[PDB]
Design a protein around this ligand. Structure first.
Ligand code: CA
Ligand code: CA
Ligand code: CA
Ligand code: CA
Ligand code: CA
Ligand code: ZN
Length: 476
């Protein structure tokens, strides 16, 4: 079979790295009238990726013909799958011609194909590296039109190019996008924002007087913690690295940060999504059985990730730590409700039930309507997440909630929900176990009604490391 033979020959051509032969075989298939499929085209795009950009001579056939091959695949109406977008992007990155990368995205659109975020990268980053703001803004407008949402690296590049070209309005808009989409910024974005506020352009941008009514109304309209009406005040910024105390008060200027509400409609949308996702991955009957059980139980003030409470910072499962956490949650519940403990059935009858009084206590919690033992093969994370979301209550876990399945939950609603609901344990020698409660304010870039900015840095563990903030306040 000829298409099956080209497959075999391109699979081999190449783990070897032979681009000149992959390009010979491509040309030969077309002289034989053998139709290249999705698989052939993808292998071919990957292999052309390995060509490198010629620093001395004019461009090599591998990269150069790679764009031709991509163009043809679309013309042929062969459907791109995830490997197509990845190899297409690798090729774009290797060539490092932002104009050619942007051409690839324009032709996807012309043929009704949805570009991916990684398709836009080599174009956007290419123009930003060249200081070409006008072209970077075109790419960004194109992304926005295709409903592709930028992440921090795209926003940071747009921020830097706006700073380089002295564009105060684009800086303002990008900073609002950082607030909306990212919330807390990486070290390098933080340093960038600090440079902005100390800069000459920042010093010289702003308004001495403004419609205070219009600001107040924008604050209500936006949901809280920003107004979006432009730079306010005049003159030099005082720009300090600082911290918030436990109540959200800036140690530099004493502004108390806002606690930003979550709209209950967004929460119900998210609960539906969460249920859909869990049922796609769990045995549906297992997850449904839990849903039905939960409808018949509670009320709950807290849901505990039992495996995480037994295991975090432990050489092996610690019933002491789980039980202490149960007792502590019950103590802080205004009506002394036991928390809902989610644990694997294998744990309810294995290592945590090793000692008879522990086993009797696990059974007592179950009999109090405060424990659900998830079935063999289940991923407990769906169960404790759904319970805390559904009961609108505290979620006790030290799980980071960022890898694997948690990526499916998105990077807007879920991080906001997590901040308001997640309780983590910490331990010290002097005191024992502590429950660390949600903050009374929102850890997000905030813009005050008078134009003052507070920008939080992102950190791995804000209980381990004290989170730094930037305070930017006009000196006059
Ligand atoms: Ca109960
Ligand atoms: Ca133990
Ligand atoms: Ca109550
Ligand atoms: Ca006892
Ligand atoms: Ca888990
Ligand atoms: Zn401040």
């Amino acid at each position: 079979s000829p298409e099956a033979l080209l497959k075999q020959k391109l699979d081999m051509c190449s783990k070897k790295g032979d681009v000149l032969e992959a390009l010979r075989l491509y040309d030969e298939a077309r002289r034989n009238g053998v139709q290249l499929s999705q698989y052939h085209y993808n292998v071919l795009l990957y292999v052309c990726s390995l060509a490198e950009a010629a620093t001395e001579s004019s461009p090599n056939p591998g990269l150069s013909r790679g764009f031709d091959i991509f163009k043809q695949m679309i013309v042929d109406k062969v459907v791109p799958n995830e490997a197509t977008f990845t190899n297409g992007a690798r090729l774009a990155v290797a060539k490092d011609d932002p104009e050619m990368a942007f051409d690839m995205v324009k032709q996807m659109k012309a043929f009704g194909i949805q570009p991916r975020l990684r398709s836009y990268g080599p174009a956007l980053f290419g123009f930003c590296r060249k200081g070409d703001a006008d072209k970077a803004y075109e790419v960004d407008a194109h992304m926005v039109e295709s409903e592709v949402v930028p992440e921090e690296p795209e926003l940071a590049a747009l921020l830097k190019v706006s700073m380089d070209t002295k564009n105060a309005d684009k800086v303002y808009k990008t900073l609002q996008r950082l607030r909306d989409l990212v919330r807390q910024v990486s070290k390098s974005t933080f340093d960038m924002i600090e440079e902005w506020f100390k800069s000459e352009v920042a010093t010289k941008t702003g308004v001495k007087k403004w419609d205070v009514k219009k600001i107040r109304d924008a604050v209500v309209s936006g949901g809280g913690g920003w107004h979006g009406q432009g730079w306010l005040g005049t003159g030099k910024w005082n720009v300090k690295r600082t911290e918030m105390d436990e109540n959200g008060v800036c140690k530099c200027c004493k502004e108390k940060l806002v606690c930003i509400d979550i709209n209950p409609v967004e929460t119900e949308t998210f609960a539906a999504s969460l249920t859909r996702l869990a049922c796609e991955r769990e045995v549906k009957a297992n997850f449904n059985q839990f849903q039905e059980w939960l409808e018949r139980h509670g009320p709950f003030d807290a849901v505990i990730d039992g495996a995480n409470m037994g295991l975090v910072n432990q050489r092996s499962f610690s019933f002491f730590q789980l039980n202490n956490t149960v007792q502590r949650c019950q103590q802080i519940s205004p009506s002394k409700r036991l928390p809902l403990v989610i644990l694997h059935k294998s744990r309810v009858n294995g290592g945590p039930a090793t000692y008879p009084k522990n086993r009797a206590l696990l059974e007592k919690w179950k009999n109090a309507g405060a424990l659900y033992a998830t079935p063999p093969g289940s991923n407990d994370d769906w169960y404790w997440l759904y319970a805390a979301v559904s009961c609108k209550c505290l979620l006790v876990t030290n799980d980071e909630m960022r890898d694997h399945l948690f990526q499916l939950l998105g990077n807007s609603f879920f991080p906001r929900w997590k901040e308001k609901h997640q309780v983590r344990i910490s331990v010290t020698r002097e005191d024992g176990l502590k429950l660390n409660m949600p903050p009374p304010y929102s850890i997000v870039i905030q813009e005050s009604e008078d134009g003052t900015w507070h920008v939080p840095m992102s950190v791995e563990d804000d209980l381990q490391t004290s989170r730094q903030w930037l305070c930017a306040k006009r000196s006059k």
